[PDB]
Design brief:
Chain A: This is DNA-directed RNA polymerase subunit. The structure is cut from a larger assembly and holds chains A (about 50 residues) and B (about 50 residues). Chain A is mostly helical and about 50 residues long. Chain A contains 3 helices and no strands. Chain B is flat and about 35 Å long. Classes of the chains: A mainly alpha (about 50), B mainly alpha (about 50). The interface between A and B is small, with 4 and 5 residues. Chain B binds 3 DNA and RNA strands through helix 1.
DNA sequence: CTAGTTGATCTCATATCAGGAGAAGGAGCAGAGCG
RNA sequence: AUCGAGAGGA
DNA sequence: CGCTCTGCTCCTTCTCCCATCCTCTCGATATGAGATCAACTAG
């Protein structure tokens, strides 16, 4: 069970939009912004800042 | 607090399920001119998206 | 040499619906081809 | 300050 | 003639994308004791 939780935490740290899985949440239901989301698209790192 | 939150933020639903809730309900009353206020009080919305 | 004082650092302990489009996989059938 | 939301402008 | 080897279409999954720029408002978001070690700080 703890291995499963660690796997979930790492995966949601990198990608928090996986279909089917629960969403890593900060507080009041606000989902975390993962590393993938920082770079994804419009307003992301590449398109938005380079 | 439930009624206060829903009216204050416009998210019609529980504060925890804010992403699920429909937003834009309960907007801030427009007071630029009297006609603006009257129109805002008679406004209809289609939730189509 | 050689013990005593001074700081940093770690441990531990105390409670309570009116998307869509395309690409990748698997499925079942159909047949071809050879033992 | 951050996040989100909303209303607007061209 | 059994058994395999593709292979063919087809349905399912899944993952991706959805103009630019600008303004404003508004709501939400411990403490000490003991041990170790190392620098002294002198004898």
């Amino acid at each position: 069970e703890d291995v499963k939780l660690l796997q979930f935490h790492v995966a949601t740290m990198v990608d928090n939009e996986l279909p089917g899985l629960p969403r890593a949440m900060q507080k009041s239901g606000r989902p975390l912004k993962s590393l993938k989301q920082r770079l994804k698209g419009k307003e992301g790192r590449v398109r938005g800042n380079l | 607090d439930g009624l206060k939150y829903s009216l204050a933020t416009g998210n019609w639903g529980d504060q925890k399920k804010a992403h699920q809730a429909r937003a834009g309900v309960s907007q801030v009353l427009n007071r630029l001119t009297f006609a603006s206020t009257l129109s805002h009080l008679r406004r209809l919305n289609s939730p189509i998206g």
